[PDB]
Structure formats: structure tokens, C-alpha cells
Design a protein around this ligand. Structure first.
Ligand SMILES: CCCCCCCCCCCCCCCCCC(=O)OC[C@H](CO)OC(=O)CCCCCCCCCCCCCCCCC
Ligand SMILES: CCCCCCCCCO
Ligand SMILES: [Co+2]
Lengths: 212, 102, 218
């Protein structure tokens, strides 16, 4: 049963360059290979059928080549919306099989995060809990550190972090950091501070609010 | 004329067998690992290949029911060729014997 | 129009059984196949099986453990995948796709997120995230909302019922003590808010709830 090997598993490219995804089959399959794009949280979308045949409504910069056992998807002039997983699939022999995928990552210019801190909501406090939310937005590269201080002193407990995949809108990354407390624990402190340390600057970017 | 009636029928039955043949092959062969006779366009080419006996061997059924289909296609092609040839002989023989006054 | 319709979510208990559906529309031919494909979070696509609905014949990936059974209703043109005796290895997004008997999947459904767990369905609490009174600004303002304590995944979060899509990130959920929480972020021009309205719509399919939450200044 036909094995499709995709190399490499991650492809890092610069905006505007021509990129090429590989797909090697375990035996000769003519040109019976099709390509799919799957963006973050989206479903797959057919890009190229039968090694090189274009699909209607797919940008003219996607093309395909190959025959037998060696197949290539190319993108001319890569751009942000191209950030995605790419799969090949064969229909030469039963059963149909998929490759394991190649992720496209774009190397953009360095960008500092935009930091925003948000006080607990009236409605959440009512419910008897309080979440302080910090957003670190549109930064490059992905490596970033967040620090929480309550009233000048570092906090580590109750802090949950989430990081987005690379953005298909601008090739950046974002992270959110959520400190969750009871209303009681929240009521007996004054200032909450979120600190972001990133490659783009010596000094951390800092955002705080007073409960009063 | 019986012979043209027969030759006409067989040629319509042949086209029908080639089309149903393509459909049935794919249905019979999907499910069987290594089967290549598994999409309709190539399966229809396969059917023509088979009915004519042209023997490329680029595609063939690997299953019992694919192979049964293959045989019905062969026999339909073979039968319709024999009926066309026999009709052409009947035509020529009756025309030669009128070309002799007989 | 949307060619293949699937439910957003299905929660299933370990050992239990679920029947997924895939309603079709658009051009239909008696030669069409419906395929099912499984994706575990962070992983690749995996072919499960296929059915020719206008003949009832189904074929399965014999290289994996057989959890699926495929059926079709030709009058409502729905494809069904009966998944049975599920463990947590069976938690994944299951897509259906349409093939015109020519080898490629032209159209796909949006997928059904199947979660296998004993834990219980919980709609989310949506709380606004407007800036504090002290926060200064430039040409742009960041707003958000906090989707908390839901089960299972997924939630879909829109801004102004889809019209506002530039400058939005929804962060992945974090699971703690059998409940999911996430935030969604939106950025708009400073001048435009609160002049022009900003609202997050939060659909959670597993509980059948879609709640709206407007973002007003504190
Ligand atoms: C006279 C017969 C000529 C054979 C050419 C078909 C090979 C097409 C191909 O190998 O070339 C490839 C190309 C496909 O991209 O052929 C095509 O697309 C063209 C599609 C051709 C036919 C449509 C499929 C026929 C359906 C039969 C089963 C349906 C009822 C059962
Ligand atoms: C003589 C023709 C045999 C019919 C084969 C139909 C395919 C059955 C599928 O399993
Ligand atoms: Co005589």
C-alpha cells in the first residue's frame, strides 16, 4: 500500500521566494497525485490534481510537477496566506493514501509585541471569579516570555498561557496569558502587571491596571 | 436485413457493455489492495482495450468480479466483431451473386 | 453554496457509539463516492473508508482497527459513519469528502469534532474585555472577549457576526479540570470605537448555544 513521503516536515522560507514541497511515492504511480492545503482550524482544499493540473479559483502561483515516484508542489512568490500544512494524496492503487504533510513557515522581519492588559469583567466578578487577561500580539520571532506581578511582586501560580500558530494574515505570532483568581483573592490586591520580554527590545514591555 | 439488424444491435450492446463495464470494474476492484482499475475514466479505456484485445497490460482486474466483468466485455467485443464480419460477408456474397445475374 | 454539511461536535463516552452525518448538495452523480478522513489534533489526514451511496457498497482502511461502518440515505442524500466502542484514541476531527470517481477530493465538509470522555457538556461563559480607565492609545484599539468553562471543543468566535475579520486572533483553548477556556482578540481603529459597535458572537455546537456579547467602555 503506497507510502508517500513528504520532505521536509517543515519548510521555512522568505516572503516572495519560490518554495517547493516534495512528495516521494514508494512505487511508480504515473501522475496520480493530488495536493491539498489545510490552514489552521480549516478543512483541506484541493490545489492541484494529477500532479500538475490547475484547479479553478486557486492562485496562479501554485503549480505542480513530477511523474512516477517524485512529485513537487511549487509556490511562486510565497506570501502570508500560504502559511499552512500541505498534503499529497495518491489515487493510483487501492487504497488511496495521504502523505504526512509539510508545514510552511514564513520568515518575516522582526516585530515587537503589542501588549494589552484587561481587568476582570463586572459579570465575571458577579460569578465569584476573576481573570486578568494579557494579549501579546503580532510579534516576530515566536520566542517570547510573559511575567505577572501583583503589587510589585512576581506571580506564577494560576497563570495559563496559549500561543497561536503563525498568522496567515501577516506572518506574526500572538500569545495570551490569563491569571485566574477568586474574587476574594483579587479584591485584596491593588495593581496587576503583565510584562513581556522579547528579542526586539532590551527592556520588557509592561502593562498594568489598578483595581481601584 | 437480419445481418444488419444483428450487427447494429451488437454494436449498441457493445457500447452499453463498455459503459456498464467501466462502472462495474471500479465497483468490483475498489476494496482490493493493489487494484489499479479503480477510477471511471481509465476503467473505460480499460474496457475498450479489453473488447478489442489490444493487450497493453497497463490495467487489468485483480478480483473475481472484475475478471468476470472483463470476460463479458471480451465476449461482447468478440461477438460483435464476428457479427459485423458475418454481416459484411452476407452483403458482399449477395451483391456478388447479383453481379453475376444469379 | 456549502456542498457537504456536517455537525460541529459530538461528545461520546468511553465504550459508547456515535453515528456521524454528512449531508450533500450541488451536482450529484450515481458515480460519486463519499470518503471519511480522520485527523487527530496536531496530526495528519488518515483515510477511513469510502461508500458509493447509489449502490450501498463500502470499503474500509484495512490497515487500522475497524471502528467505522458506512451507510447512506439516497433520498435525503446523507452519508453516515457509525463509529462504535470508542476510546480516547478515537478523539479527532472526522471529515467527509466527495469524490467523482476520479481519485481526488474536490469538496470537503467542515468536520465533526468527536471528543471521547466521561466529562459533561457545559456551555461557555462569555465575558467582555475592554481596556481599563488608565490605558492610553494610538491609532488603534485592542478589544477581546473571554470564553470560559466549556466542554467539549470546539467553539467558533466571530466579531460582528463575521463582518469584522481583519485584526482578529482566537487563541487555542487550554484544558483544566475537564473544562476549556480561551480568549479572542480584535483590533480596530481608535476613532471608530465605541462610535461603531463591536460584538463577539460565540457559537458552541455541542450544547447548541450561540451567545452574543457587546464590548462597551468600562
Ligand atoms: C472511446 C474511448 C476513449 C477512452 C478515453 C478515456 C480515457 C481518459 C483518460 O485516461 O484521460 C484522463 C482524463 C481524466 O482527467 O480523461 C477524462 O477526464 C475524460 C473522461 C472520459 C470519460 C468519462 C468517464 C466515463 C464514465 C464511465 C463510468 C460511468 C458509468 C458507470
Ligand atoms: C458478470 C458481471 C459481474 C457483475 C459484477 C458487479 C460488481 C459486484 C461488486 O462487488
Ligand atoms: Co442459387
Amino acid at each position: 500500500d503506497i507510502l508517500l513521503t513528504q520532505s521536509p516536515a517543515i519548510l521555512s522560507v522568505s516572503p516572495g521566494e519560490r518554495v517547493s514541497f516534495s512528495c516521494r511515492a514508494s512505487q511508480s504511480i504515473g501522475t496520480d497525485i493530488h495536493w491539498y492545503q489545510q490552514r489552521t482550524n480549516g478543512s483541506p482544499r484541493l490545489l492541484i490534481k494529477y500532479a500538475s493540473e490547475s484547479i479553478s479559483g486557486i492562485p496562479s502561483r501554485f503549480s505542480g510537477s513530477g511523474s512516477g515516484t517524485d512529485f513537487t508542489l511549487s509556490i511562486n512568490s510565497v506570501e502570508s496566506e500560504d502559511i499552512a500544512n500541505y498534503y499529497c494524496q495518491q489515487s493510483n492503487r487501492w487504497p488511496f493514501t495521504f502523505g504526512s504533510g509539510t508545514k510552511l513557515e514564513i520568515k518575516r522581519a522582526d516585530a515587537a509585541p503589542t501588549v494589552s492588559i484587561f481587568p476582570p469583567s463586572s459579570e465575571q466578578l458577579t460569578s465569584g471569579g476573576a481573570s486578568v487577561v494579557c494579549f501579546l500580539n503580532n510579534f516576530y520571532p515566536k520566542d517570547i516570555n510573559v511575567k505577572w506581578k501583583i503589587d510589585g511582586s512576581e506571580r506564577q501560580n494560576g497563570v495559563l498561557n496559549s500561543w497561536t500558530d503563525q498568522d496567515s494574515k501577516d506572518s506574526t505570532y500572538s500569545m495570551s496569558s490569563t491569571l485566574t483568581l477568586t474574587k476574594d483573592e483579587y479584591e485584596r490586591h491593588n495593581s496587576y502587571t503583565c510584562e513581556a520580554t522579547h528579542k526586539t527590545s532590551t527592556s520588557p514591555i509592561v502593562k498594568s491596571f489598578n483595581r481601584n | 436485413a437480419l445481418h444488419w439488424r444483428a450487427a447494429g444491435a451488437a454494436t449498441v450492446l457493445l457500447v452499453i457493455v463498455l459503459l456498464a463495464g467501466s462502472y462495474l470494474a471500479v465497483l468490483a476492484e475498489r476494496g482490493a489492495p493493489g487494484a489499479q482499475l479503480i477510477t471511471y475514466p481509465r476503467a473505460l479505456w480499460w474496457s475498450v482495450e479489453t473488447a478489442t484485445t489490444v493487450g497493453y497490460g497497463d490495467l487489468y482486474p485483480v478480483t473475481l468480479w472484475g475478471r468476470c466483468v472483463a470476460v463479458v466485455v471480451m465476449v461482447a467485443g468478440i461477438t460483435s466483431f464476428g457479427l459485423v464480419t458475418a454481416a459484411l460477408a452476407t452483403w458482399f456474397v449477395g451483391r456478388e451473386q447479383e453481379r453475376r445475374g444469379h | 453554496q456549502v456542498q457537504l454539511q456536517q455537525p460541529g461536535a459530538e461528545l461520546v463516552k468511553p465504550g459508547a457509539s456515535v453515528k456521524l452525518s454528512c449531508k450533500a448538495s450541488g451536482y450529484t452523480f450515481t458515480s460519486d463516492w463519499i470518503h471519511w478522513v480522520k485527523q487527530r489534533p496536531g496530526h495528519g489526514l488518515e483515510w477511513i473508508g469510502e461508500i458509493i451511496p447509489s449502490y450501498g457498497r463500502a470499503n474500509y482502511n484495512e490497515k487500522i482497527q475497524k471502528k467505522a461502518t458506512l451507510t447512506a440515505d439516497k433520498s435525503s442524500s446523507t452519508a453516515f459513519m457509525q463509529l462504535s466502542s470508542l476510546t480516547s484514541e478515537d478523539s479527532a476531527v472526522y471529515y467527509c469528502a466527495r469524490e467523482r470517481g476520479d481519485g481526488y477530493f474536490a469538496v470537503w465538509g467542515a468536520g465533526t469534532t468527536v471528543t471521547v470522555s466521561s466529562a459533561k457538556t457545559t456551555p461557555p461563559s462569555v465575558y467582555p474585555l475592554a481596556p481599563g480607565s488608565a490605558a492610553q492609545t494610538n491609532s488603534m484599539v485592542t478589544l477581546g472577549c473571554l470564553v470560559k468553562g466549556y466542554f467539549p471543543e470546539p467553539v467558533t468566535v466571530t466579531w460582528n457576526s463575521g463582518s469584522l475579520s481583519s485584526g482578529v486572533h482566537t487563541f487555542p483553548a487550554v484544558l483544566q479540570s475537564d473544562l476549556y477556556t480561551l480568549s479572542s482578540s480584535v483590533t480596530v481603529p481608535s476613532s471608530s470605537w465605541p462610535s461603531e459597535t463591536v460584538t463577539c458572537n460565540v457559537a458552541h455546537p455541542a450544547s447548541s448555544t450561540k451567545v452574543d456579547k457587546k464590548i462597551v467602555p468600562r
